[PDB]
Design a binder for this molecule. Structure first.
Ligand SMILES: [Mg+2]
Ligand SMILES: [Mg+2]
Ligand SMILES: [Mg+2]
Ligand SMILES: [Mg+2]
Ligand SMILES: [Mg+2]
Ligand SMILES: [Mg+2]
Ligand SMILES: [Mg+2]
Ligand SMILES: [Mg+2]
Ligand SMILES: [Mg+2]
Ligand SMILES: [Mg+2]
Ligand SMILES: [Mg+2]
Ligand SMILES: [Mg+2]
Ligand SMILES: [Mg+2]
Ligand SMILES: [Mg+2]
Ligand SMILES: [Mg+2]
Ligand SMILES: [Mg+2]
Ligand SMILES: [Mg+2]
Ligand SMILES: [Mg+2]
Ligand SMILES: [Mg+2]
Ligand SMILES: [Mg+2]
Ligand SMILES: [Mg+2]
Ligand SMILES: [Mg+2]
Ligand SMILES: [Mg+2]
Ligand SMILES: [Mg+2]
Ligand SMILES: [Mg+2]
Ligand SMILES: [Mg+2]
Ligand SMILES: [Mg+2]
Ligand SMILES: [Mg+2]
Ligand SMILES: [Mg+2]
Ligand SMILES: [Mg+2]
Ligand SMILES: [Mg+2]
Ligand SMILES: [Mg+2]
Ligand SMILES: [Mg+2]
Ligand SMILES: [Mg+2]
Ligand SMILES: [Mg+2]
Ligand SMILES: [Mg+2]
Ligand SMILES: [Mg+2]
Ligand SMILES: [Mg+2]
Ligand SMILES: [Mg+2]
Ligand SMILES: [Mg+2]
Ligand SMILES: [Mg+2]
Ligand SMILES: [Mg+2]
Ligand SMILES: [Mg+2]
Ligand SMILES: [Mg+2]
Ligand SMILES: [Mg+2]
Ligand SMILES: [Mg+2]
Ligand SMILES: [Mg+2]
Ligand SMILES: [Mg+2]
Lengths: 106, 172, 197, 111, 127, 49
RNA sequence: UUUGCUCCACACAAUAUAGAUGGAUACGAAUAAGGCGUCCUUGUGGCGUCGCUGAACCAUAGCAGGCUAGCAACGGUGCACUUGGCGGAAAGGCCUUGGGUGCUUGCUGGCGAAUUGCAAUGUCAUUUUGCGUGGGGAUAAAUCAUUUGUAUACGACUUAGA
RNA sequence: GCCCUGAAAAUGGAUGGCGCUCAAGCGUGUUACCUAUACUCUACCGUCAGGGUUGAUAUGAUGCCCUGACGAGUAGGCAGGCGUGGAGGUCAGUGACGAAGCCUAGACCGUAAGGUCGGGUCGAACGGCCUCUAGUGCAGAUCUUGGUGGUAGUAGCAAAUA
RNA sequence: AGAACUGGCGAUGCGGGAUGAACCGAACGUAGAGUUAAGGUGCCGGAAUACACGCUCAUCAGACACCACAAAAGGUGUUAG
RNA sequence: GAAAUUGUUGAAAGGGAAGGGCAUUUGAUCAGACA
């Protein structure tokens, strides 16, 4: 109606990392309203999209998308690890991200 | 040392042709598993008889379950504990539902008040205080008064999200 | 959850407000803090007075300008507790710090906006009752903050208008509860009940 | 080290999943009973379970049976170690020494 | 049109440049191994450049294959070019840099005739 | 080591910096406290030396 | 110095973007105490009730939400207007009156949707800028040089000059 | 036991920092969680080892096929290779329709030493392979000779009356 | 400053002890997934503002080995004997 | 007619150096491979 949204909103927090070294191949996602590991097992394998904007049109859109999937859970607070087709830029720490409901299991 | 169990542990003094069937001593031992309890058994026997695990044998190991696990009991406890400057016997009293629960908070107390790690303490005796007013320690006696009641003032509720829209109330 | 989150500073422990405020911006959550003069530090006033003076004597010996800067205002006492929890020399940190505003009192627009609270920083929820604590406005006016009186003046005025506001509002939701009563017992109402509403 | 008394179960699941033979060195996996009979048939022992039997029973040929098995390479435990520090004794709340029947829960998490 | 090959994994695609070849001009980028006693690079301190080593060696299957899938073979003339006649799906001919212009039209022509692929057809082409 | 004879410093640190002023007309940085019971007149005047 | 500047209107063009995607939804104060409703003797009052989390509240159906009819209501809401009033802490936003006009899923109808081919954000936000158009509005100064000396190493300062 | 007194040094300052007080402190217990070039499984490179294979009628016998284990390194040893001047042989090699050289955030091969191509510039010679040979590979030596910077339009160009 | 036995550093990166030749963990071909070690999980900063029983309020509290110091002697502070 | 080093033009970045490693966004540029 006014609300068309088919995804859950999310946050790009960090790369996976130690204290002093980070691995960009894994990104750490915060999923709105998922507070525990058990809650976040629902989202494992759902597909994630980071949707940004750009100057050059390409295929007729000025809007581009990096795609990926939730992979495993992270910690006890329901944060989630994910991997993307290409790794996410790290300017996107704290940027918004969308988790779609597919592949669907319900 | 962990969540505790109690163990009857029985061992004897290996047989010799000249002395078959030696004398069979039992101990009750509080341990978190049966491997500690056997080590612990041998620890005390070498403190009393002339034996060591090499020259001796454990005859049997059995867990003892609390006889009335839902009945509240007043326990007196008897402890010998090394401290930094010297070793001292003690008697504390513990009110709880099982000997195992009792021993648990004993060790916790000896750590908090007297800084005694598990290695320093010896349990000398734990036994049920049968008649009341054989309770000798005031922090237990407090809880034996007839028709006891107390409020739990200033109640604090664990919040499940980082923000709250109300403002808490410690009411209860 | 919301584009901007406004926090009533009043009744919060400085280091536990700063701690959550810091993590929120680093996750991209805008925050504005109001009434930083009603902020609390654990320990009696004298302790945090001395503690501030320890802070106060550190300066660059050859030029006191390059040296550590000492901000007396309760908001800035707070923003310092915060900045230490953010890696503020990274670009990513300057980014996150810019999602922050801290205010003495509740100035315009935020006054008519709703402000929220942080139970894990709430002093009354955390301190053992009977510990001694400090209020930021007392401490700041001690160390040279000039404005405690003007803030308290403006506030008590702002506090009176917001009571007019509230009075009207409690008087309008009195009617709304009344009209909601006639609708009760109707078919719409009874069906919604069964469905949880 | 850490060691204890393995159950038939954990021996069965050690040999089935991680069991390998030594044939002209060369560490060959035991995926068919014919490998075992080939090099252990001399002693009896023509099946993977014959091996397992000759092991747990401590057979007359245990020396040849056991030396035939390449050292099992386990992974780190999956549930972790259950201890904050490995390098005290089991009794002391670490992982080392003889932990008796508890060697099974460990080994199973490492297999 | 080249013989099928497993996916070509390059495994370190980034040139190995000499340490401080960027710092002073007199140090060319050509790889040189550090023999210094103290040197960070020789000690492999985290954060420095990496040195060539034999782990990076390419898969024996796809080695020497260029993106098309043929090894390239240097060609000075038709006789040379013809050595590939039975190999069109395996080797490609690259024309030598000093072959003249009128002579390269001859070699493209015979390569076109023979089904032999040429890696630098447009060189010196009159256009 | 230490000095060897104690002497006061030279000048007043409260008058720094010894730079030139922003303008010829020095600024009134403070005005008298206000007693509003009295009549209204000025608190300062202007003139030339 | 080739018809410039500004505010409002839309247009094409660019360039952005620390990261729109139903709603930041307003007492104060206490916490060994309070909110709310009601009553009175208006109080540090009587009586009732509630919390134990916003898991709420509001909004939410319609081609991303098309074209249309009717009924019941007289309510809701959007827009541009107009009446009166409030807000200076950074007020630059809040309230009220009255017409107009759009929508209304409060209820009942007629029509449309496919082929975007089994998914590919499938593009619906807001930044600044520039270029013409025509609806209002406005027609300066500063610096160099010259000059003073309340100033000055040079710059700078302070004067003076139709 | 914890706490307090005992408890005095020089730039301002450090439980790593912020900060923390029913702790984010001290003792002790229980779970979960995070992440090493380590462990487990897999791919690929190399080293070493064990097997197999001269049967023609095609192309490698120091080869081809199977299988296993292993991989840190100064001084140092050995090995396989890369690159220069010249010499024997050879490809009846490249070239004034452009050799060599030089240039090129253009392309490709090699783990690498390096090799290859395009384009530009250029103007007379030059390369591949098997072998021979050595005045054969530079970042240093307060290295040799030559060239060139920052310093910098800077120090300064003020004795001997004009 | 000088010996003994072993293990290291030197000749050695990697995780940890902020920092650090020698400590703890673990020794290096190029990579993928998983699990861990020592050490950690308020925020900096990956990871429980987890659970549990006590203790402690310091007008220079305290906060983890090697380690970056504190003693006799005292306290009608408080705790347990 | 190399290099150091210099002028111009074009592009880009610059809160107390610069340069470097892994990774990706954006811009520029380019090989190959479809049929
Ligand atoms: Mg599990
Ligand atoms: Mg796990
Ligand atoms: Mg530990
Ligand atoms: Mg496993
Ligand atoms: Mg050195
Ligand atoms: Mg050295
Ligand atoms: Mg003196
Ligand atoms: Mg009243
Ligand atoms: Mg009342
Ligand atoms: Mg109206
Ligand atoms: Mg609607
Ligand atoms: Mg900590
Ligand atoms: Mg603890
Ligand atoms: Mg590896
Ligand atoms: Mg080696
Ligand atoms: Mg080689
Ligand atoms: Mg050679
Ligand atoms: Mg040459
Ligand atoms: Mg260049
Ligand atoms: Mg090519
Ligand atoms: Mg040429
Ligand atoms: Mg000539
Ligand atoms: Mg030779
Ligand atoms: Mg020489
Ligand atoms: Mg040189
Ligand atoms: Mg030099
Ligand atoms: Mg050298
Ligand atoms: Mg030189
Ligand atoms: Mg000049
Ligand atoms: Mg001069
Ligand atoms: Mg002179
Ligand atoms: Mg002169
Ligand atoms: Mg040692
Ligand atoms: Mg030496
Ligand atoms: Mg060594
Ligand atoms: Mg080492
Ligand atoms: Mg340290
Ligand atoms: Mg270290
Ligand atoms: Mg050790
Ligand atoms: Mg910090
Ligand atoms: Mg974290
Ligand atoms: Mg300690
Ligand atoms: Mg110690
Ligand atoms: Mg005492
Ligand atoms: Mg010339
Ligand atoms: Mg680079
Ligand atoms: Mg092309
Ligand atoms: Mg192409």
């Amino acid at each position: 109606a006014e609300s068309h949204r088919l995804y859950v909103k999310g946050k790009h927090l960090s790369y996976q990392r130690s204290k002093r070294v980070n691995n960009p191949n894994v990104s750490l996602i915060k999923i709105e309203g998922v507070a525990t590991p058990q809650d976040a097992q629902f989202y494992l394998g759902k597909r994630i999209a980071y949707v940004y904007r750009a100057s050059k049109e390409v295929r007729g859109s000025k809007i581009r998308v990096m795609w990926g999937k939730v992979t495993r859970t992270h910690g006890n607070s329901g944060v989630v690890r994910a991997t993307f087709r290409n790794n996410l830029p790290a300017k996107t720490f704290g940027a918004s991200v969308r988790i779609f409901l597919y592949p669907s299991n319900i | 040392m962990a969540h505790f169990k109690e163990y009857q542990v029985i061992g004897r003094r290996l047989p010799t042709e000249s002395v078959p069937e030696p004398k069979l001593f039992r101990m009750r031992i509080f341990a978190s598993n049966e491997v500690i309890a056997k080590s612990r058994y041998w620890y005390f026997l070498q403190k009393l008889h002339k034996v060591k695990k090499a020259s001796g044998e454990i005859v049997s190991i059995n867990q003892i379950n609390e006889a009335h696990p839902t009945k509240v009991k007043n326990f007196g406890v008897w402890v010998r504990y090394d401290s930094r400057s010297g070793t001292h016997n003690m008697y504390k009293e513990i009110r709880d539902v099982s000997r195992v629960a009792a021993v648990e908070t004993l060790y916790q107390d000896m750590a908090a008040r007297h800084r005694a790690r598990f290695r320093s303490i010896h349990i000398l005796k734990v036994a049920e205080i049968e008649k009341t007013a054989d309770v000798k320690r005031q922090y237990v006696k407090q809880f034996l008064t007839k028709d006891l009641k107390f409020p739990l003032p200033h109640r604090v509720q664990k919040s499940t999200k980082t923000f709250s829209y109300k403002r808490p109330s410690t009411f209860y | 959850v919301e584009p901007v989150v406004v926090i009533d500073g009043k009744g919060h422990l400085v280091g536990r407000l700063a701690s959550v405020v810091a993590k929120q911006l680093l996750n991209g959550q805008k925050i504005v803090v109001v009434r930083a003069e009603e902020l609390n530090i654990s320990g009696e006033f004298f302790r945090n007075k001395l503690k501030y003076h320890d802070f106060l004597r550190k300066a660059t010996a050859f030029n006191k300008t390059r040296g550590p800067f000492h901000f007396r205002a309760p908001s800035r006492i707070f923003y310092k507790a915060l900045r230490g929890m953010v890696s503020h020399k990274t670009a990513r940190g300057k980014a996150a710090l810019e999602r922050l505003k801290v205010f003495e009192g509740i100035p315009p627009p935020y006054d008519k906006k709703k402000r929220v609270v942080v139970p894990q920083a709430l002093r009354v929820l955390r301190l053992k009752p009977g510990r001694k604590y400090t209020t930021l406005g007392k401490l700041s006016t001690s160390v040279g903050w000039k404005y405690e009186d003007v803030v308290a003046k403006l506030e008590a005025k702002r506090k009176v208008s917001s009571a007019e506001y509230y009075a009207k509002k409690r008087a309008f939701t009195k009617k709304v509860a009344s009209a909601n009563a006639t609708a009760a017992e109707s078919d719409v109402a009874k069906q919604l009940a069964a469905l949880g509403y | 080290v850490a060691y204890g008394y393995p159950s038939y179960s954990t021996i069965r699941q050690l040999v089935y999943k991680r069991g390998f033979g030594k044939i002209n060195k060369q560490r060959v996996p035991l995926s068919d009973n014919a490998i075992i009979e080939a090099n252990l048939g001399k002693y009896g022992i023509l099946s993977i379970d014959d091996l397992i039997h000759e092991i747990i029973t401590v057979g007359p040929h245990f020396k040849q049976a056991n030396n035939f098995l390449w050292p099992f390479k386990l992974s780190n435990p999956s549930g972790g170690w259950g201890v904050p520090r490995k390098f005290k004794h089991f009794i002391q709340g670490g992982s080392f020494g003889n932990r008796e029947e508890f060697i099974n829960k460990l080994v199973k998490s490492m297999n | 049109a080249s013989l099928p090959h497993p996916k070509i994994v390059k495994k370190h695609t980034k040139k190995f440049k000499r340490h401080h070849s960027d710092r002073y001009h007199r140090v060319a980028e050509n790889w040189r191994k550090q023999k210094g006693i103290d040197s960070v690079v020789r000690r492999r301190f985290r954060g420095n450049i990496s040195q060539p080593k034999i782990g990076y060696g390419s898969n024996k299957k796809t080695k020497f294959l260029s993106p098309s899938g043929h090894k390239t073979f240097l060609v000075a003339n038709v006789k040379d070019l013809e050595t590939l006649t039975m190999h069109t799906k395996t080797y490609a001919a690259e024309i030598a840099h000093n072959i003249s212009a009128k002579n390269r039209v001859v070699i493209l022509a015979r390569a076109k005739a023979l089904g032999i692929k040429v890696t630098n057809p447009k060189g010196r082409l009159a256009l | 080591s230490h000095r060897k004879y104690e002497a006061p410093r030279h000048g007043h640190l409260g008058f720094l910096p010894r730079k030139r002023a922003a303008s010829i007309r020095a600024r009134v940085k403070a005005f008298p406290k206000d007693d509003r019971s009295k009549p209204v007149a000025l608190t300062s005047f202007l003139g030339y030396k």
